[PDB]
Amino acid sequence: MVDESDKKQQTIDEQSQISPEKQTPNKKDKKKEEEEQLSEEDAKLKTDLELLVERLKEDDSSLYEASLNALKESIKNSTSSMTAVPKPLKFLRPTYPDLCSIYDKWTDPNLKSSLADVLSILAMTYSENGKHDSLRYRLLSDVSDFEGWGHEYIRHLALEIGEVYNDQVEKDAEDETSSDGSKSDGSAATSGFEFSKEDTLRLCLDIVPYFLKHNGEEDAVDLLLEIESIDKLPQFVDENTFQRVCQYMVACVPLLPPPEDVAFLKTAYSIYLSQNELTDAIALAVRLGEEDMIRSVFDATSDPVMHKQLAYILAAQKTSFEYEGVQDIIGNGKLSEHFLYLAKELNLTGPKVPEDIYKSHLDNSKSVFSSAGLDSAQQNLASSFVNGFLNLGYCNDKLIVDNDNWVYKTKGDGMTSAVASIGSIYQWNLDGLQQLDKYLYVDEPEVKAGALLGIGISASGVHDGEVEPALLLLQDYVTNPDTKISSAAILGLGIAFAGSKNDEVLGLLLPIAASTDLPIETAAMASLALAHVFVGTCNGDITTSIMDNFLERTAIELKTDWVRFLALALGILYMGQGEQVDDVLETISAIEHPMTSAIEVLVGSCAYTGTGDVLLIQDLLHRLTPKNVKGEEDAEIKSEEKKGKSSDKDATTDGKNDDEEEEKEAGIVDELAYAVLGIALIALGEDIGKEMSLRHFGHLMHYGNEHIRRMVPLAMGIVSVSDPQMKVFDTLTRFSHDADLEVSMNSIFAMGLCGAGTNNARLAQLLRQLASYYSREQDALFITRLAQGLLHLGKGTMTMDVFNDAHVLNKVTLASILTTAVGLVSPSFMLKHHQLFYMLNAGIRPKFILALNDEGEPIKVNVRVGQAVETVGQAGRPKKITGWITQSTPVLLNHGERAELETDEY
Amino acid sequence: RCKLKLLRMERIKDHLLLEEEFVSNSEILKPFEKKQEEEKKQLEEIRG
Amino acid sequence: PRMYEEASGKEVEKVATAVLSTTARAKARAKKTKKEKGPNEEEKKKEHEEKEKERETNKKGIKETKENDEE
């Protein structure tokens, strides 16, 4: 440290720690006297650079501060940075660290502030040279180790980040602001940013998201594509690149409300497309929900290869996975045109092959019955629905149904729902139609109507490839003028096709849903069906639905139930979009009534989805307001008010649910809670309001996909035994279902205690019984999620009928609706060319460790489990493929996706 | 971006939750005013 | 001069502070929103007419400052 002169080269370094003699006196004097001596300075630049490098190792603040103190002055005091024009410009390389030594190494508040501004200007001017890039680089990849650079290099990088962010907030931009003093754009800093990005991508990760999003343009993202696609395999593997990308969309997913969010995720899709794996491509294309992006990946395998190859099989698998059936319709018919084989290809895309694999899983799952043996009165009705609820999905319980004794003892609305429950035994199955047919041609109209509902449920697993579509059966019934018959028919058609908006299905539903002049309560199903059809894909926000809602309000207000169902139907219709839904909020609000205000708060949730924090706060001010106005005064109306209050509560929960899914998974723990206080609250907000918030909570959890499933449903449940409306229990169980018999051991006991214990009304008893059977599926047959499963950010289309029903007080009429509850997840199996129905091995992981994702890419250690197991729910969801040791390579990466495994054995 | 994504969701939700419960403290006592409010008076006098 | 009692101001006070609080919390989400929000306004209208979108606020002031009652 101490000066020991020029005795050897080692002690020259020690000499310049206190006072440099080759950077301070000599150089300073030289610059301030002769200008022939500019030639001597130029040679001495190289020497000066070396002395910095050697003393980088030294970290002490005092011996960088004082040493380079008079050089820091010289910039404006003696040199003035223009006494020899080029020469000070190219000698700004040693002087730039001198400024940083007062910024970061020494902290003097007055100078630390002031010289930040100076650093920005000189960074820009020296990046013209392109040597400011090289200045950054020697510290980014390092040459020496010291604590100092670890705080310092960031400051250089921060100059760029500063200005670019400021141009959005303050419209004036450029160097007009004195907060940077550097121009925002122009060909002098733009080339600096590109070069900087290159070095920082290789070694770091830091400044790359700040730059793209701060420009605010998709253009920034499209520059990124170029650099990364080079890097895809030689620099590092495909996998490392995928983890590098998906996050541009994810940190900044929640962080894109509609117009930006779509434009950024377009680019990520394209990056994946460019790279080797098309498997990553399909996942992002589904995400966007655009028809256009789906087609391009499907075409990419199908069209170029003339031969059948792997390519046709692979295309069919990829589109099959979404059980919305949106991909299914689009992908069909290309197979027909090409014509290698119609028979294998068409079946494989359709959900017909999913019926067959279910038999293999079922061969394992068998049957254990537990259904209620109660008969007579309302207890007969309870038991007969319960049988269907335990045998959801493909199950064989034919003989019990064929005993027509208990069937005929149902009465009223009970008959309709009894036949509907029979259909859920043969849910997702071609056979089952036979049982329904018997009743349909005999007795009163009530059994005829219930048959049509059951056809709907059964037709879910078979409606593609022109193999017994739901359309075929149900068209005749729509024609028939009876209201019960027609209403039942169009409900079942919507369920079966789900998100598919095929020409025949859509166009049948197109002239209708436009009569509401005639007062019919069960014409809720008119719009309700059409709304269900629309979800799963981008929405036209159809003019048929918007018109009829307004017309209904004009005609009637007597049937409170009718207008409440209608309001929800609009909000569910708009799901699958958010850009266009900003427009329609205004359109609805054009005509103003207090009744119309009820509709608006619902539609606000969908428009504002993919952010909600302006939405959240809004849906809370609303809650306060009823109380606020009566509150204010001391210091026909019935229908309008009630619609008003209820809509808001539903809207609050809905807003939260879509928001929690798409974006960061940690926050989910709290979002359930935004409700616990919401509930305590409403249970608190009005006497009337308490009734609504109870029911909403259960579907909050199911939609939101809470991590915790043990504590919160059970605890809430106890309080709500005392409280009226036993429909609370039904909504809790749809969440609790999980992976069956993990969560659900506690659930059956807890729900069973209140139900068995208390009988004081057979009406109250009925709701409790149905909820219990729903929760469990024998021998872990299937799971239900609201989510797609293909994306865990995703949201289904079949589960939207579940979400609808919790907005109203319980009714016998509502029981008919509740039979439908579709939303199946398939169990993965390793496929072959002969369609092998067994998985070899898999790893399951309860909790992803990887803090290189939210989703957590499944690691490679895992816990090993056997063949032919259901894809586990929460606390099992990350799933890695074990097959690599046995000479097998997955073709279709599976992370705990719905998607069936496919392997190529070598 | 990989830490941030986690943070952005989870923080904003803990800030809202906290705020929610402040407005809500008052709101607990509102669905009653003699239905439970009265009950509370009766228990207390007994206790002293 | 008049005597009165007012007890309804406990409700006014309570929501005033509620609406104030929610904005502070929003601070982190909101930065990310602002960038996307602006182009929407440029395209459509500012708040109820196109007119005067060039500043964030161009109109400030107050219409009275004058008050001395009796002399």
Curated annotation (Swiss-Prot), chain A:
Region Disordered, residue ranges: 1-44, 170-191
PC repeat segments: 417-449, 450-487, 488-522, 523-563, 566-598, 714-745, 746-780
An annotated GO BP: ubiquitin-dependent protein catabolic process
Any one GO CC term of the record: proteasome regulatory particle, base subcomplex
Gene3D superfamilies named in the record: Leucine-rich Repeat Variant
Modified residues (Phosphothreonine): T24
Basic and acidic residues: compositionally biased ranges: 1-11, 24-34
Residue numbers carrying Phosphoserine: S16, S19, S178, S187
Keyword Phosphoprotein: yes
Keywords per UniProt: Phosphoprotein, Proteasome, Repeat
GO molecular function: enzyme regulator activity; protein-macromolecule adaptor activity
Acetylation is among the record's keywords: no
Biased composition (Low complexity): 179-191
Additional free-text comment from the UniProt record: Present with 306000 molecules/cell in log phase SD medium.
Entry function: Acts as a regulatory subunit of the 26S proteasome which is involved in the ATP-dependent degradation of ubiquitinated proteins.
Protein family per UniProt: Belongs to the proteasome subunit S2 family.
Protein name: 26S proteasome regulatory subunit RPN1
Source organism (scientific name): Saccharomyces cerevisiae (strain ATCC 204508 / S288c) (Baker's yeast)
Swiss-Prot record, chain B:
Annotated compartments: Cytoplasm; Nucleus
Highest taxon in the source lineage: Eukaryota
Job of this protein: The 26S proteasome is involved in the ATP-dependent degradation of ubiquitinated proteins. The regulatory (or ATPase) complex confers ATP dependency and substrate specificity to the 26S complex. Has ATPase activity.
Annotated family: Belongs to the AAA ATPase family.
Listed name of the protein: 26S proteasome regulatory subunit 4 homolog
Organism: Saccharomyces cerevisiae (strain ATCC 204508 / S288c) (Baker's yeast)
Gene name tied to this protein: RPT2
Full-protein interval shown: 54 to 101 of 437
UniProtKB/Swiss-Prot annotation, chain C:
Record PTM Phosphothreonine, positions in chain: T17
Comp. bias regions, Basic and acidic residues: 36-67
Coiled coil: none
Stretch list, region Disordered: 26-67
UniProt feature, compositional bias: Basic residues: 26-35
Highest taxon listed in the record's lineage: Eukaryota
Modification after translation, per record: N-acetylated by NAT1.
Subunit structure and binding partners: Interacts with UBR1.
Family: Belongs to the proteasome subunit S1 family.
Physiological role: Acts as a regulatory subunit of the 26S proteasome which is involved in the ATP-dependent degradation of ubiquitinated proteins.
Additional comment: Present with 4750 molecules/cell in log phase SD medium.
Protein name: 26S proteasome regulatory subunit RPN2
Native organism: Saccharomyces cerevisiae (strain ATCC 204508 / S288c)
Gene: RPN2
